[PDB]
Nucleic acid binder design. Sequence first.
RNA 1: GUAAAUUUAACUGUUAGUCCAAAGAGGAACAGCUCUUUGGACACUAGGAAAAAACCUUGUAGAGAGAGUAAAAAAUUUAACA
Lengths: 150, 177, 100, 75, 49, 153, 98, 94
Amino acid sequence: TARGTPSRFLASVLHNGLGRYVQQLQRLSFSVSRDGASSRGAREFVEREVIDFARRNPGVVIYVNSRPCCVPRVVAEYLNGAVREESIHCKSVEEISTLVQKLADQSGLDVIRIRKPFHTDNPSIQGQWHPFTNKPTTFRGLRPREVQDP
Amino acid sequence: SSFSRAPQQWATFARIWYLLDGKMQPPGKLAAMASIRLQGLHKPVYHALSDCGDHVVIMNTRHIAFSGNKWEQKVYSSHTGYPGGFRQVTAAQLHLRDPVAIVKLAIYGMLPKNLHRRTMMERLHLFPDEYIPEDILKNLVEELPQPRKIPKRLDEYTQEEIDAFPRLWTPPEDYRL
Amino acid sequence: TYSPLPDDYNCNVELALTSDGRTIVCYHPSVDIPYEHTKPIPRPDHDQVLKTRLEEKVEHLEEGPMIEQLSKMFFTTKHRWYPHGRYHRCRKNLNPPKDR
Amino acid sequence: EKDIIKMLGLEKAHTPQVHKNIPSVNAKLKVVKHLIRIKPLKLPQGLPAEENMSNTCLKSTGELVVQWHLKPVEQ
Amino acid sequence: VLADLAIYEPKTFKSLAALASRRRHEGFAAALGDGKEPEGIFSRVVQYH
Amino acid sequence: KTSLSSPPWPEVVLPDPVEETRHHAEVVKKVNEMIVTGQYGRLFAVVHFASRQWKVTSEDLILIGNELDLACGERIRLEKVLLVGADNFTLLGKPLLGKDLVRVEATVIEKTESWPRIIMRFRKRKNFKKKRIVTTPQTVLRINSIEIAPCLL
Amino acid sequence: MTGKELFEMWKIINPMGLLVEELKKRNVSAPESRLTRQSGGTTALPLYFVGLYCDKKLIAEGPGETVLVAEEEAARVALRKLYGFTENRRPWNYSKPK
Amino acid sequence: RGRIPGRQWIGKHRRPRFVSLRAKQNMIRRLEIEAENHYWLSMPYMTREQERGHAAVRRREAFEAIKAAATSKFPPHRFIADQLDHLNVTKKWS
RNA sequence: GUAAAUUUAACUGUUAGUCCAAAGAGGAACAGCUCUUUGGACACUAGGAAAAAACCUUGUAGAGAGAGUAAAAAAUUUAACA
Ligand SMILES: [K+]
Ligand SMILES: [Mg+2]
Ligand SMILES: [Mg+2]
Ligand SMILES: [Mg+2]
Ligand SMILES: [Mg+2]
Ligand SMILES: [Mg+2]
Ligand SMILES: [Mg+2]
Ligand SMILES: [Mg+2]
Ligand SMILES: [Mg+2]
């Protein structure tokens, strides 16, 4: 639920997209098994998909380590320092490619509840409302039931 | 507004003292005006958890006017808890015993039935007559218009207004009247 | 001499339509508070031998009278000024999210 | 009445459906006339043609316009 | 949006309030009128085709 | 003259349409001259995007609740602008402003998914209980600039 | 500098003193501080709006819980308008140079 | 002190229910809609004699499609490739 | 106008019923009573009649910090007389 989980406001990293867009994904670490049956899709991704994916993302360093493992995993590290580990256990090549592409498009911020679906550092241009915004002034600023020059 | 962050927040959520004159005014209409201000419902920044209530000052609560025969028909009832302690008093009896009770009960019933209502009543100030404490007077901001227009008596009309209204019938010259 | 709303409290609202009638143009310059509608700021507020020392006039009060003083000072009820147990104190988020 | 509504293709409310003005169709309408709004179909520019099949729209006035440019009128 | 405009753009909201007030008055004049007068300036509707 | 002889509301006399038409042209020209000379600061706009109306200004962020089929970093223009306003003037559409009048551009900076959402059903004394978790795709757009051209005639 | 204010980045002491010097360079008379708005003066939560007037013309206005704080805030608002660092100023143009 | 014997809205003694101003308006609004429906059902385009048989060809062809789909049920084809592709579960790198 | 229907093969469960509207019977033109028939609702969703199984509105399932609506508020104040 929302009460039982943390929350945050919508934000970006270093005001990304304002002056220029910088891909927040920084590193991908794949762990595939040469003989593991659950790593069949992971091996298929490495054979034909990871090479083309590296061409399209020159700013992301991809490490493919082939070691014995029962559950293949991919570790995504972002510029802000967040580390996200995702399992590719018994996933097809298409599912892995969708998952890898999903990691590249994320900003690295925590995937939790966002209070407002918008953020603005300048919510007001004409001036934020205060109780005297629509109250006319009186001569000499006299309060109600006030006598002047007693 | 190019204000600093701390003063900008202080200005938006400041409390405003409102003055309301209850002479010849129905308590319910006074209560409806007071209830909105006490809850903060008159502000675009209103929210239940923002605690944006304002202070309402009502004077001349002794000189309120009840439409119809509500002075003799409206009954305010309460129980003291002890057996045989069910007390029912008319509006006339309660007004004489307490000049501010009638307006106070009307405002109290219009506020939300929650734990914020008693706080809102602490921002409500009632005075039976035109006397108001100097501290309360010095912090007033705006005087709300009276909800009901007080009709003028027959002797309050000027001669120009009396002459303006035409005579409608010609009485017989030999009628005693 | 017709104006939809008074122009003496917030801004001077002027409504207009373009030639084709597809756009509504509103000109609302801000209104400045007149000098004549302002109060001056309250700038104004013995051969003593001994140096004037600061005297602590803050006498300690009991829990009862202090809360009555606090309630009247801020026009609240007494219930807000009583403490709450450790269960509620630890549940409060000491580093809440901050927006702008 | 539930069955006739299904026969007329009126399962979803507030979804216009076109039916022929013939006695047999009107007989079904008379049964469920209290559940429906009946309006005549208007053709200011006639029946849609093959060229303007994809540019048709049914307005709230009952008129089926064969041209829908989503632009204000220049008049 | 109107709630946001009320809090952060009071000058814009007053113009919207004035526009609604002007349109409201034009409706009153149309009702009292017999129909031998042109539509109000802000009462005109932009037709789309 | 009695209490009910006349309506309580004061009489309202609308301006002469012949005279008011000239007055409207003066106001439009006055506001149009401001755009030519650049007499405006920060601009806020209300755009209709993804079935919702968003009040946005420059350097803002909006969280769309669906995928936009756009690569991250691509800049797009929001063609539906209902309102554009400044510190002194405001332009209203009926119901949409012209494209030449106002131009709003946004940049795709993040394509992600929402936090898990619990969908639970329960009916007492009926052994009815089902659970579903859904993550809706989301796209984060940054409003880069809002530009207005002197197209008020 | 997206959401940061001028004086949140440029920390100053006694803004009123700096405001007076700026107006002298512009050949403008010394500003006069007056109370434009006031609420809850005798209470524990007051509101004051102090306006700065040069030649009986309003240049800035600022809120505050006390007259001294509100007057200081008004000086900051006056400096922001003079320096061009208003909150509603023109946003920075990040578009590619022509 | 004022209580309805038994349940409120059922029984010999019931809590009285009164028709509000908007309750009448809603019924009148729906009455006007149905009155207009009576008018538009009073002008058929063709008579019953003219209507007869004008859509028999389409109706017959529509039911023939239903018969064709009903009698087309059969197990799907089975392919050797589907059975042989199961051997890929043990595919390993050399 | 519609897309269902019958037949063939294989079985389970339901077979202790409530209110409302209507035509009746029993009782007392009593019952939140009892027994049949026609239909609705309930034993599934949501809004409304204050709370509310049975009246009204409304059904096909998700997300949204958009929008148009449905049903939906109780009215009434009276005795002169040749
Ligand atoms: K009953
Ligand atoms: Mg209490
Ligand atoms: Mg009961
Ligand atoms: Mg059997
Ligand atoms: Mg029974
Ligand atoms: Mg039945
Ligand atoms: Mg059962
Ligand atoms: Mg309920
Ligand atoms: Mg639905």
